[PDB]
C-alpha cells in the first residue's frame, strides 16, 4: 500500500494535509460554535448585568 | 483586377486565425477570417438598421432614429421595439470594428509592415466603446448610449453637453479640441509642403527635402523633419480621439456638476485664495 507515496514529495504531502486540516478544523469549529450555543453561554455567564 | 506591380505581393501567410482557409482576395479586397466576420457583422448590423428604419415613422435618411432603451432597463436587454434593437446593432458594430482592426493587422503582416495602422484605428474604437459601453456601464444603464440616426445623435450630443450647463468648460474637452484644431493645421501644412516641392511653378526643377525643411523652419522656427511630421500627425490625430474618450467618460461617472464650477480649484490655490 505504501507504494502510493512513491514519486511524491513528502513536504508537499504534509503541506496539503496540514492545510486541509486547518481548513476543516476551522470550518468545523465555527459550525459547532453556531449549533452548540458556545461560547455564547460562556460570555453570558461572565457578562456584566 | 490588380495594380501593375501587385501580383508578386499576393503571397499566403501572415494570418492571425484561419491559415490558408480564407487567405485569398475578392476583387481588390483581401478576405481572411476577419474579412468573413467583418461581412457577417456589417450585413447583420446594416439589415437591422434597415429594420429599425422600417418600423420607425419615416424612410427619410436624415430622420431615421434607432434609439437606445429607457434607463429603467438598466444593464439588461430591453424589448426589441423599445431599444433592444439598438443593443443588438451595438454588438454588431463592436464586432465589425474589431474585425476590421484585426483584418488590418493581417494585411500589414502580409506586407511586412509595422502594426501602426491597426493601433491608430484602435483610438477611434476606444472612443466609440467609451460612448456606448464604458460610460453607460459606469452609469449603470445602456440607455445612456447615443441613438443611431444622422441628426438624432446630434440631439444627444447637444443634450449631454447641456447636462453640464456649459460643456466648453470641461478641461479634457478643451485639450481634445486643441488637438483636433492643431491636427487640421498640421495636416494643411504637411499637404501643402509636399505638394509645393513636388509641383513647383512651371519650368522650375522638382524640389527637395532641403527646401521643405528650410521653409518649414521659417514657419515654426524649428525643423520637424520627414519622420517627425508623421509622428506629430499621428500623435495629434490619435491624441484627439483619446482625449475625447477621457472628456466624455469623466462627464457623469466622475463629475456631475456644471463644468464651470470645476475651475474653483484654480481660484483657491493658496498663493492667491
Amino acid at each position: 500500500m505504501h507504494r502510493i507515496w512513491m514519486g511524491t514529495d513528502p513536504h508537499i504531502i504534509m503541506s496539503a494535509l496540514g492545510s486541509f486540516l486547518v481548513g476543516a478544523v476551522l470550518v468545523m469549529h465555527i459550525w459547532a460554535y453556531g449549533q452548540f450555543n458556545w461560547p455564547a453561554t460562556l460570555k453570558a455567564k461572565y457578562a456584566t448585568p | 483586377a490588380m495594380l501593375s506591380f501587385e501580383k508578386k505581393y499576393r503571397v499566403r501567410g501572415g494570418t492571425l486565425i484561419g491559415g490558408d482557409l480564407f487567405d485569398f482576395w475578392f476583387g481588390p479586397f483581401y478576405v481572411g477570417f476577419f474579412g468573413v466576420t467583418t461581412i457577417f457583422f456589417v450585413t447583420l448590423g446594416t439589415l437591422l438598421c434597415v429594420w429599425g428604419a422600417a418600423m420607425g415613422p419615416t424612410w427619410n435618411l436624415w430622420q431615421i432614429n434607432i434609439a437606445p432603451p429607457d434607463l429603467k432597463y438598466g444593464l439588461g436587454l430591453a424589448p426589441l421595439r423599445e431599444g433592444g434593437l439598438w443593443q443588438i446593432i451595438t454588438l454588431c458594430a463592436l464586432g465589425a470594428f474589431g474585425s476590421w482592426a484585426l483584418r488590418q493587422a493581417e494585411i500589414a503582416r502580409k506586407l511586412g509592415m509595422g502594426m501602426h495602422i491597426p493601433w491608430a484605428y484602435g483610438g477611434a474604437i476606444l472612443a466609440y466603446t467609451t460612448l456606448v459601453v464604458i460610460r453607460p456601464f459606469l452609469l449603470g444603464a445602456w440607455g445612456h448610449g447615443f441613438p443611431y440616426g444622422i441628426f438624432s445623435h446630434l440631439d444627444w450630443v447637444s443634450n449631454v453637453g447641456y447636462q453640464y450647463l456649459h460643456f466648453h468648460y470641461n478641461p479634457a474637452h478643451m485639450i481634445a479640441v486643441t488637438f483636433f484644431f492643431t491636427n487640421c493645421l498640421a495636416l494643411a501644412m504637411h499637404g501643402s509642403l509636399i505638394l509645393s516641392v513636388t509641383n513647383p511653378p512651371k519650368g522650375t526643377p522638382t524640389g527637395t527635402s532641403e527646401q521643405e525643411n528650410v521653409f518649414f523652419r521659417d514657419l515654426l522656427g524649428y525643423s520637424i523633419g520627414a519622420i517627425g511630421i508623421h509622428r506629430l500627425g499621428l500623435f495629434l490625430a490619435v491624441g484627439a480621439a483619446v482625449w475625447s474618450a477621457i472628456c466624455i467618460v469623466i462627464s457623469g461617472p466622475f463629475w456631475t456638476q456644471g463644468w464651470p464650477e470645476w475651475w474653483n480649484w484654480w481660484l483657491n490655490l493658496p498663493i492667491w485664495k
Partner: protein, 62 residues
C-alpha cells in the same frame, strides 16, 4: 416668393456639385501610379480614367 427654395439650400447644392467634381479630380490623381490594372480579361482603367504618369525634372546639378 419661392417658399421652399432658399439661399442656404441653393448654396448647399452648389457645394455638392463642386464636391463631387473634386472627388472625381482626386480619383484621377490617385491613378497616376499602378494603372491600368492587370486582369485576366486584359487591362482595366476603373472610373474615372486616371491621369497619365508624371515625369519629374531633376535639379540640373546642384
Amino acid at each position: 416668393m419661392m417658399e421652399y427654395i432658399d439661399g442656404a439650400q441653393i448654396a448647399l447644392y452648389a457645394f455638392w456639385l463642386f464636391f463631387f467634381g473634386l472627388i472625381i479630380y482626386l480619383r484621377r490623381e490617385d491613378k497616376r501610379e499602378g494603372y491600368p490594372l492587370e486582369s485576366p480579361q486584359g487591362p482595366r482603367d476603373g472610373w474615372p480614367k486616371g491621369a497619365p504618369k508624371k515625369t519629374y525634372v531633376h535639379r540640373d546639378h546642384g
